[PDB]
């Protein structure tokens, strides 16, 4: 998280921390629990084999609170375009169910088919890198502003406001950055977006997947 | 047994993922080897294939070393250096296509 402050421990019990095995190395993402056995994340956080971690805060400590679960399935969206990062939404189904409690229980998705409204302040969170050289052991969070879809249509070649949200004041140093992919964008304690891409420089605005544009496919999939 | 972080930029956009290339610690490799991993992650992370690299206007990666130096390498240039380079001297890799 760029431009943020350390999150209060377990104040956000839906956060997942994904460890991903690639053909050539490892990748690390965030995600969020949307049902007691289901994690919502990004689709470019897919790997052959994915160890999920719930209920953590200091992710580099072997904590009493954490639950370490592997992903039974990794369901990428069928129309996910790798090249343009279009339809960047993946469901992870856990290999055993979580114990609901103080530090592990899901966040709500939106009621049918409402993305967002410009000007709105929302919160994104994750264990992503905080700068070009350092990362975090701990969950950190920053409060971003929803932008007018004009901004992104000028800067990103493949931005689609039907399925994506445009987020982040260009003037502030506030964004989600590397390692935050698949984290939730919360407004009113509802996950309206999934952290997806932006410029490599961290320079806002950046693009989130509009969760509510895939509500039919999420229910279907968990069914 | 070491992790080298890399970033990929394709057509201006870059996924917000923390990506790592695994290397055996303290292992001397060449820039063919480095190019083949760069071509690898370009295909897996972004669907970017050799004919895509060829068709693009310019495609390169930059290796940032821990001694604050950098080396910038063009993927469409045929040229590369007959030097072995140490895995554990690499700080990070920036791919840009």
């Amino acid at each position: 998280i760029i431009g943020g402050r350390e999150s209060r421990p377990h104040s956000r019990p839906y956060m997942a921390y994904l460890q991903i095995q690639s053909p050539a190395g490892q990748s690390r993402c965030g995600g969020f629990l949307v049902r007691e056995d289901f994690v919502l994340t990004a689709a470019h956080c897919w790997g052959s084999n994915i160890n999920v971690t719930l209920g953590a805060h200091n992710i580099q400590r072997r904590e009493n609170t954490q639950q370490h679960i592997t992903a039974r399935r990794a369901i990428r969206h069928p129309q996910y375009n790798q090249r343009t990062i279009q339809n960047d939404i993946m469901l992870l189904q856990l290999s055993r169910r979580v114990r609901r409690n103080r530090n592990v229980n899901p966040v709500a998705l939106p009621r049918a088919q409402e993305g967002l409204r410009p000007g709105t302040l929302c919160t994104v969170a994750g264990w992503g890198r905080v700068s070009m050289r350092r990362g975090t052991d701990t969950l950190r969070e920053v409060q971003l502003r929803v932008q007018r879809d004009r901004q992104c249509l000028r800067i990103f070649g493949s931005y689609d406001p039907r399925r994506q949200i445009c987020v982040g004041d260009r003037r502030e140093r506030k964004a989600a950055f590397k390692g935050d992919s698949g984290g939730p964008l919360l407004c009113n304690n509802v996950a309206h977006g999934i952290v997806s891409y932006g410029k490599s420089s961290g320079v806002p605005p950046e693009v989130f997947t509009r969760v509510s544009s895939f509500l039919p496919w999420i229910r279907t999939t968990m069914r | 047994t070491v992790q080298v972080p890399y970033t990929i930029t394709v057509n201006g956009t870059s996924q917000n993922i923390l990506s790592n290339l695994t290397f055996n610690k303290n292992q001397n490799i060449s820039y063919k080897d480095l190019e083949g991993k760069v071509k690898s992650v370009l295909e897996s992370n972004r669907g970017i294939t050799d004919v895509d690299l060829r068709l693009s206007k310019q495609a390169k990666y930059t290796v940032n070393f821990k001694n604050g130096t950098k080396k910038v390498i063009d993927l469409k240039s045929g040229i590369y250096t007959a030097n072995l380079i140490n895995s554990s001297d690499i700080k990070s890799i920036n791919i840009n296509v």
Binding site: - | N26, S30, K32, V72, T81, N83, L84, N86, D89
Partner: protein, 218 residues
């Protein structure tokens, strides 16, 4: 070296191996008892603190008694351009002088401005990869090669192994090119891959830099 043979033990007493923990990463030549010569890109992205200079080696896997090891105390470059691969030459001052013997000797340089012509017979060498796969050599390899002029630069010295896929490979950077008993080249870069059989290898032309080399070593 790709397509080469093992050299007679200590046939080239000026051959040098530059090493870090993981071992050899470039070649080099002894040009004075406290001065070795290698290619610029060899050191540009390494920490010179750890470069060890191995004089008098033959099989890099073994303990050798003939060996002598120095650190680099100071480097000298002569307008290195890392993008264009121009003036790809560097001189390293060791933290001591070599005990010259049958296994450690100084090589002999050409005259300033002497340019080699198309067809000259030369010898290339190094502990580089033995083919496009496989690993660093153990025993120092050598290869008879022919200086060429087509598909090259006036600021480079190219070689070719006609009708064979042979040439330098990774780990040969900074290794000498020998022509008429003199060191005329410094192994610099390849094209379209090791041992292409189509594109010549490229050596930094040592004779364009002779005045600069002399003044530093006296």
């Amino acid at each position: 070296i790709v397509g080469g043979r093992r050299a007679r033990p200590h046939a080239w007493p000026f051959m040098v191996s530059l090493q870090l923990r993981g071992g050899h990463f470039c070649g080099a030549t002894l040009i004075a008892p406290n001065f070795v010569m290698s290619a610029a890109h060899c050191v540009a992205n390494v920490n010179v603190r750890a470069v060890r200079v191995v004089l008098g080696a033959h099989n890099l896997s073994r303990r050798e008694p003939t060996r002598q090891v120095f650190a680099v105390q100071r480097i000298f470059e002569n307008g290195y351009d890392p993008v264009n691969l121009l003036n790809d030459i560097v001189i390293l001052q060791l933290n001591g002088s070599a005990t010259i013997n049958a296994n450690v000797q100084v090589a002999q340089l050409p005259a300033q401005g002497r340019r080699l012509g198309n067809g000259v017979q030369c010898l290339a060498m190094g502990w580089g990869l033995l083919g496009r796969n496989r690993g660093i050599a153990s025993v120092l390899q050598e290869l008879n090669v022919t200086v060429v002029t087509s598909l090259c630069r006036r600021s480079n010295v190219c070689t070719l192994v006609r009708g064979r896929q042979a040439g330098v490979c990774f780990g040969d950077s900074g290794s000498p090119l020998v022509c008429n008993g003199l060191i005329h080249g410094i192994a610099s870069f390849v094209r379209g891959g090791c041992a292409s059989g189509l594109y010549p290898d490229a050596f930094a032309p040592v004779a364009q830099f002779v005045n600069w080399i002399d003044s530093i070593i006296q």
